[PDB]
Request: fold
Amino acid sequence: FKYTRFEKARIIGARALQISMGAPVLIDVPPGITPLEAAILEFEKGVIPITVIRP
Amino acid sequence: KKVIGSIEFGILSPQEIRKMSAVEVTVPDTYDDDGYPIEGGVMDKRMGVIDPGLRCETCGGRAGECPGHFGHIELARPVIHVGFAKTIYRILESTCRECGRIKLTDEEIEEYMKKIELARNRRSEFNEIIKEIHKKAKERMVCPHCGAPQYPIKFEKPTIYWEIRKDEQGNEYRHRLMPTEVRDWLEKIPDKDLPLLGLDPEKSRPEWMVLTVLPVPPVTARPSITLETGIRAEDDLTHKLVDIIRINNRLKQNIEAGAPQLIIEDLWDLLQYHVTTYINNEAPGVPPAKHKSGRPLKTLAQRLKGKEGRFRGNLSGKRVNFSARTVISPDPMISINEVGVPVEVAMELTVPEKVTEFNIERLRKMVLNGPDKYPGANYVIDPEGRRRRIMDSNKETLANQLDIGWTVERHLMDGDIVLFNRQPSLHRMSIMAHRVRVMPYRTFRLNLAVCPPYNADFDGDEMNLHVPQTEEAQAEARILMEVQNHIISPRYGGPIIGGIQDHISGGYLLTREGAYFTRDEVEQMLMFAGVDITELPEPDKYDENGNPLWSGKTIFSLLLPEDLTVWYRNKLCDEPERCEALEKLIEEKLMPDPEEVRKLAYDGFVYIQNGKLLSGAIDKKAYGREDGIILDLIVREYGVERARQFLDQVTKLTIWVITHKGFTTGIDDEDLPEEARDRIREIIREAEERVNKLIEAYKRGELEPLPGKSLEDTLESLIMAVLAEARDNAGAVAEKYLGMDNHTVIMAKTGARGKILNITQMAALLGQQSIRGKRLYRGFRGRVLSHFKPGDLGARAKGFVVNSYKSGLTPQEYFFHAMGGREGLVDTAVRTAQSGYMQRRLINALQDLKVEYDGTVRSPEGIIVQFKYGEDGVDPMKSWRGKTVDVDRIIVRTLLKMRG
Amino acid sequence: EFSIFDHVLVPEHRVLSEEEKKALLEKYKITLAQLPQIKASDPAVKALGAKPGDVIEIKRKSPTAGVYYYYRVVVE
Amino acid sequence: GLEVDIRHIMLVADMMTLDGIVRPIGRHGVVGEKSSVLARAAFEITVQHLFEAAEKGEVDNLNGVIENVLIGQPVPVGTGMVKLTMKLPLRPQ
RNA sequence: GACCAGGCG
DNA sequence: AACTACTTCC
DNA sequence: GGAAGTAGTTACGCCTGGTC
Ligand SMILES: [Mg+2]
Ligand SMILES: [Zn+2]
Ligand SMILES: [Zn+2]
Reply:
């Protein structure tokens, strides 16, 4: 399963939005990291709870 | 919360307007003397309030919070809606006068209903069928359902319906159709007949086109401002409504009192004109309603249509918050995906960051700093939604009360993502996402390699900076729009982000034959480029004093991937025999002995082997706006981060080379020896003699026309051909004599800047000037200037400038060159306007087309446009210069990977 | 003698059978209204026995993919 | 001397010849055959399109890009086509 | 607020 | 103004 | 088929000032 650019962007955006509203980070992040960078770190590690559905 | 799923458009019924209204307006006044709105006027508080301090009688909300409410004007006599005028005329001439049926046969009715049910998806077929039905009904004279003559109906410009009847035996008269009888005719139309006329039985009714109740737009939809002079400036809609109310009151008074029919008709026509100009002031064949000053009023139609109208001016494009604009300046020392932001803009624009577990300390520090210090914040928003501006006597308390879940609008800091845009916006690379880097001075900074996508040239250019505010928008920008991507153009599948002028020229000065560098220079350039290195490679030569020297090719190879291998001929190939020898050596085994290649090394044949540059010089072919072989291979075989790293390093390296090695252009760059000057002089002399011979032959009738054109055109074409060939030969002589050690030549042969034509015009003759492809002819009769004999067709007399820029132009040649420059400058603006219009049309036609998950391209209603995008499924951005896959490149790469 | 199919511009046309038309419509999950249309008065249609409501498969001879099949319905 | 990919030309030509006839790209062609009312009214003639749509009672299903921008809703392109799902119980490592 | 004029890329 | 395209009288 | 009429468009920002 290979994510497209748009699927990756949507997943990272949704994860960052969730993190900004108190959803706990699934990994360890450096202090001072912005929520978007935390979501990008989460995606790069590979721990992605959001799943895309296709027709 | 809900989202709009669809919008059904219809015609409002009079009962709908009556019920939706909050007031019936009777008084044609706006405000009283004291300044309060007149009850019953256009500004009645039951339609909403706009003046601060007032209160709405329908909502109870203050100004700016009350949405606005509708009112109605019960018209004394019904009027005709101008928008539906032609529709009413078509319906009138397609339906019976007495019963109202469509005047079509029952068999025709059922057949056309069946054909209406079919072919409804597309508008064009339905419209054509409607026109056919309209023609068939219009031609008919007698209603088939009920025997009755159907007098033909004539229609002048708006709201004038005039059917013609036979008043007397053999004499016919035209009878004007008042809105009352027209509306009654429309009400008599049955519901089963509407679909064949195109009308919807429920969402529309033909009778509702004749409007007897006029809705009044809310106060908030037509605000009035008080001028600094103390007078009140009303909207155009307000004035038009006031006039409509006044005329309606006059008509009602004359109707209830009783007046002669002519005066009543005149007042009715006045009211109809007022309503028509209210709906559409620029309707065909109507005198526009002019303001007291003298300008025409802007009404509903003008509110909607136009480039300044509602749709284009406030819906498709609209002004936005959190944006900045200033002049851009170059900055080679920031990465390609970065932008230098002034401290003023960073302090002004803010990024809303919700405080979390990890950024609590940083947000506390920036709240403590406040709006004054740069790493600070402006506002703090509690979870309840109440916002507090940070100021003195607030910073300590707000920092204490930061907690978790609050919002802090902090200043821009390094790493933030923004949108950067220079907005003549032609392609999608006009907006890319850049990483913020805060800078002292008040100008935007941009890496030089990113200029070609923006078409920016640092001559006063300004670019807009937009700060995304939501985390979803920030992620979208940072993932889809960053400058690391979009290196390859979707237009041609080639590199658009590359070296432009100084990178190319410095690369040539680096990698050319005989270019060597000292140890200090090598270490300094490697540190400047950002290349990480702990040991220099073994030197190539040794100076007369024993000093080690490095070749430029080794330094360039220090920043190439260790697996890369490619060969190609660049623009510096002047002797193809050496290139052929190198290719013959390579083709025998594909892994030639490096020393054997070094024996036959040539500047016009670039040959990289295992990341080591063994032959060739850096050119526009290595990296550039088009046809960057090395950059394309690095971005297609190693990723997009490696391409960015290589681009940054090579740009900095070439900049250092060109800066510390010296690159200049002087007067001597256009000098030619006496032999070259004599050869050019003989070239022009022979060209002029040939033109004279052609003119003499044409004067004696000796010349005969070329096929496809007359004698005059034949002579003109021959003369232009001779002049162009003479210019080409003189340019060839200049190219032969100037040489490759000239800096002006260096930047032209390497594609850094300028063509051979510029050098030809600067060191040799300027050549023939022309407008619209013809010789210069506009001026006096038989000549261009009064300094030439009339009827002269010679070379000099028609625009052939025989001087170089260095040699200086004569006044005649100066005027001719001015004409040429003027034609070019005139061409530019016309071309850009036409191209802009064509691009707008193409975009509005192809906006929504997209690739589905099955690989096809489909229209919004589901129509399949392409069963496989590009007929093979390959995106042009990801393609190899338009090819699906570079087969030979893959074969060579794999064979070298395994056999190597 | 001269058929329009021998022209280099014109790609080869062919009428699909009912089974093939059903397979095509099932493949892309579409209705005949969702296909591109070709007029029944078109010369390529008239050169065949095609009638309105029919699907024509066109061997387009792409420059990028070599061959490429394009489908058009016949309308009046 | 301008280099444009063949695929863009193919897309434009296929959209131009999608109705069985060659039709323009402007208001009397591909744009005029768009189903969305607001998309057509945004391009060039505006009052005519709105009045004629109100006459026939046309519906704008908002399946395109232009109208969704006009109303302020996600466009069905790019990231606007991605449907996301998520299993609720999240356990940090 | 819309009209005009002049510029900038 | 200068282009197109309809429309519409002829 | 004319032969006129009629209508519909004609790049994107940005800045300044001046008058209503
Ligand atoms: Mg510029
Ligand atoms: Zn209100
Ligand atoms: Zn009847």
Residues 308 and 314 of chain B are 8 Å apart (CA to CA). The first helix of chain B runs from residue 14 to 20. The pocket of zinc ion (ligand 2) is lined by residues B 48, 56, 58-59, 61, 66, 69 (CB under 6 Å). Chain B is about 40% helix and 15% strand.
